[PDB]
Design a protein around this ligand. Structure first.
Ligand SMILES: Nc1ncnc2c1ncn2[C@@H]1O[C@H](COP(=O)(O)OP(=O)(O)OP(=O)(O)O)[C@@H](O)[C@H]1O
Lengths: 337, 389
């Protein structure tokens, strides 16, 4: 409702909507629908085969409103509305079609040679968004009617498995309406009035809205196992790749604070290839899924070392020591966030 | 001022403005681009995931700036008040900040043509350098164009080729009509490295380091022409036949590149001269010109070698193998071994820095008892002042 509809669109769409209805009836009758005065959907019988004027006014209304939401959604997507050329309305190429691909009546089934125009992938993604929007509109209409999702189709209980998110939607139906929308938006392109779509660029904060208020969970050994002398080793296997830190912790580490943000933990961030103690620096490289990180502490020389799949990680310099010097204090225990 | 230079009045009316340009605008450009290497590289392509997106508009403006300042440096070293060093340093930095995939994928056609024109003018500049230097061996326009070429032409092409190679960006940049110029530059640089004169004696190093960058930047294995037709990316496949007939193209790889020898031939002279063990000072040209191609060639087309991909075999652009490596790098080792005793030289330092990644490429089970001889020989030659690594 908030978007307004431009004058070029308002005087060209009537033709667009009749063209889309003609293409719809044509590809249905080509995939095998024949003519019949009696109304039957299983016997593929269409009492609305007639032109838009003799078409039921309610169905003509559905056609106009579907093209409305089509162009209005195209504008809402950020389309750089502009005039391209009147050359396509000047000259248009009608094909000669054999009787086998032809229809019974004398209608022109393919006004434009759809082939030579190839749709840009950026354009293709926007038609995917159009399919998404149309599916959502239909789904909310069903919800207004009272339909709910079910594993099995039952009109008596108003249950429909198709009432699922479009990414979860079944491939056959989604590709069918997807190719129909290909056809509609692509003939819209073929009338030469190609709306200048926005340059699709992605740059975003990218879903910081993680579940719950927890950003991390810290796993550590019991404080009684704190080591104050000797040379110690343990391994940390990364099942996935992401924001995980491993290292050694003081018995005073706080569960709610990130490892290495303060003085009570020495950690290694492999997601950013960083080492953490009262701040972050650059150390080592990044791991992948299945990588194993070996953690090494030496309490009598006060040194810490790390490995990734066996090889020892390096600092910015040639130093092999993650943390050169630290006090023994009350000891250290294995820790991972 | 180029127009008024022939004029009697040599008092340039806007000398103050041009000095402001040179002293301020160019160096601030330098500091900005050097502070921001990667912001221009960060176009949501994963570098600098924290953000710092550089717009497509920003990058074709960067490319147009590069091309226009190259136009300024064209033959204007004399007018520049010795600031050509700063000019070429900015040439470098804009070179590394270039982003060829994005600029070619989306770009404005005047900037397109400006960059193609710039590369064509540079190619024909070095071509006329070739022609005048070889037709005339007698000793000031000729020496002026020669020292302009040596000072500016080689460094800028080297910087462009280097950033292309170290990114792996620029392959789509070299898609059409860039390759004719690239073959012209290839034939020209090969002719410089093959001919002998006091000039190429002066720039021993420049003409031995430009070829290495060109090999890395250039995406077509011109050495292995036997399967070059079968690469789809090949301009030979791209140009159909009608475009051959329209353009001035010999339609044959052997016809368009007759000077450059075959890869097997380079290899067999490398073997012959290694077993010969001649002194560095009878024929330095080979181990300063062919060897950079070995290092850079193989470094660029490992992954393009069929060995790495059993799928898609023999329709890769090249043909590379660990056995090639165990032959050629061992050949390098024999060369350095037998010539350590004679005349030494910093050229071995240059080869070491070029081949620093090659030892990483070679497997550890291929280091043992192969490079360990290098360690024992280098420590045994304490009498020789030369040390490596
Ligand atoms: N009156 C209508 N005629 C045709 N298609 C419609 C109609 N109303 C909506 N549509 C669109 O077509 C889809 C299904 O319409 P149609 O009557 O052809 O059903 P179908 O695919 O045969 O199956 P179903 O029985 O599951 O609805 C709807 O989801 C909607 O996108």
């Amino acid at each position: 409702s908030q978007i307004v509809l431009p004058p070029h669109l308002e005087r060209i769409r009537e033709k667009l909507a009749e063209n889309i209805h003609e293409l719809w009836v044509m590809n249905k009758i080509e995939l095998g629908w024949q003519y019949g005065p009696v109304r039957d959907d299983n016997k593929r019988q269409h009492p609305c085969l007639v032109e838009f004027s003799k078409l039921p006014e309610q169905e003509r209304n559905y056609n106009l409103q579907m093209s409305l939401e089509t162009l209005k959604t195209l504008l809402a997507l950020g389309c750089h509305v502009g005039i391209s050329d009147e050359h396509a309305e000047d000259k248009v190429k009608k094909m000669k079609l054999p009787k086998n691909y032809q229809l019974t009546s004398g209608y022109k089934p393919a006004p434009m040679d759809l082939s030579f125009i190839k749709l840009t992938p950026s354009q293709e993604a926007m038609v995917d968004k159009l399919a998404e929007n149309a599916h959502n509109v239909w789904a909310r209409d069903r919800i207004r009617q009272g339909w709910t999702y079910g594993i099995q189709q039952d009109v008596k209980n108003r249950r429909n498995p198709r009432l699922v998110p479009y990414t979860l939607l079944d491939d056959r139906t989604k590709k069918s309406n997807k190719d129909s929308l290909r056809e509609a938006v692509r003939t819209l392109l073929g009338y030469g009035y190609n709306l200048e779509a926005p340059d699709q660029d992605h740059a975003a904060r990218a879903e910081v809205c993680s579940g719950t208020g927890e950003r991390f969970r810290i796993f550590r050994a019991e404080k009684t196992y704190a080591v104050k002398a000797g040379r110690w080793y343990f391994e940390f296997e990364t099942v996935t790749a992401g924001d995980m830190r491993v290292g050694w912790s003081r018995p005073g580490c706080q569960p709610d604070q990130e490892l290495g943000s303060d003085e009570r933990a020495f950690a290694f961030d492999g997601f950013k290839a960083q080492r953490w103690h009262q701040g972050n620096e650059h150390y080592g490289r990044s791991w992948q899924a299945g990588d194993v990180v070996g953690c090494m502490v030496d309490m009598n020389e006060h040194t810490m070392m790390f490995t990734l799949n066996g090889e020892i990680l390096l600092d910015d310099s040639g130093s092999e020591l993650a943390f050169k010097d630290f006090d023994v204090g009350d000891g250290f225990i294995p820790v991972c966030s | 001022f180029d127009g008024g230079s022939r004029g009697k009045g040599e008092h340039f009316p806007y000398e103050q403005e041009i000095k402001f340009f040179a002293k301020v605008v160019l160096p601030l450009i330098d500091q900005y681009f050097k502070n921001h290497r990667l912001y221009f590289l960060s176009a949501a392509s994963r570098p600098l995931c924290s953000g710092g997106h550089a717009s497509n508009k920003e990058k074709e403006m960067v490319t147009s700036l590069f091309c226009k300042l190259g136009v300024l440096v064209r033959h204007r070293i004399s007018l520049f008040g010795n600031d050509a060093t700063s000019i070429v340093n900015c040439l470098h930095i804009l070179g590394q900040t270039l982003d060829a995939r994005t600029v070619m994928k989306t770009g404005l056609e005047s900037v397109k043509s400006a960059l193609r024109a710039f590369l064509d003018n540079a190619a024909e500049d070095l071509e006329k350098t070739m022609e005048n230097l070889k037709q005339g061996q007698f000793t000031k326009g000729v020496t002026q164009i020669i020292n302009y070429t040596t000072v500016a032409l080689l460094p800028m092409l080297s910087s462009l080729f280097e950033h292309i190679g170290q990114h792996q960006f620029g392959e789509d940049l070299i898609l059409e009509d860039v390759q004719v110029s690239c073959y012209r530059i290839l034939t020209s640089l090969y002719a410089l490295g093959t001919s002998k004169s006091i000039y190429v004696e002066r720039q021993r190093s420049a003409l031995g380091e430009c070829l290495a960058a060109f090999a890395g930047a250039f995406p077509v294995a011109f050495l292995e022409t036997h399967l070059d037709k079968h690469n789809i990316y090949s301009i030979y496949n791209t140009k159909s036949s009608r475009e051959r007939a329209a353009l001035s193209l010999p339609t044959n790889v052997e016809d368009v590149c007759p000077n450059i020898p075959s890869l097997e031939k380079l290899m067999e002279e490398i073997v012959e001269l290694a077993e010969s063990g001649i002194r560095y000072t009878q024929m330095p040209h080979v181990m300063e010109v062919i060897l950079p191609m070995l290092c850079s060639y193989m470094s660029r087309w490992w992954e393009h070698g069929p060995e790495n991909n059993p799928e898609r075999a023999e329709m890769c652009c090249t043909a590379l193998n660990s056995e090639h490596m165990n032959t050629l790098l061992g050949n390098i080792l024999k060369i350095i071994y037998n010539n350590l005793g004679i005349d030494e030289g910093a050229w071995m330092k240059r080869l070491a820095v070029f081949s620093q990644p090659i030892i990483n490429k070679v497997k550890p089970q291929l280091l043992k008892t192969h490079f360990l001889p290098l360690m024992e020989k280098l420590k045994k030659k304490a009498a020789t002042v030369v040390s490596e690594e």
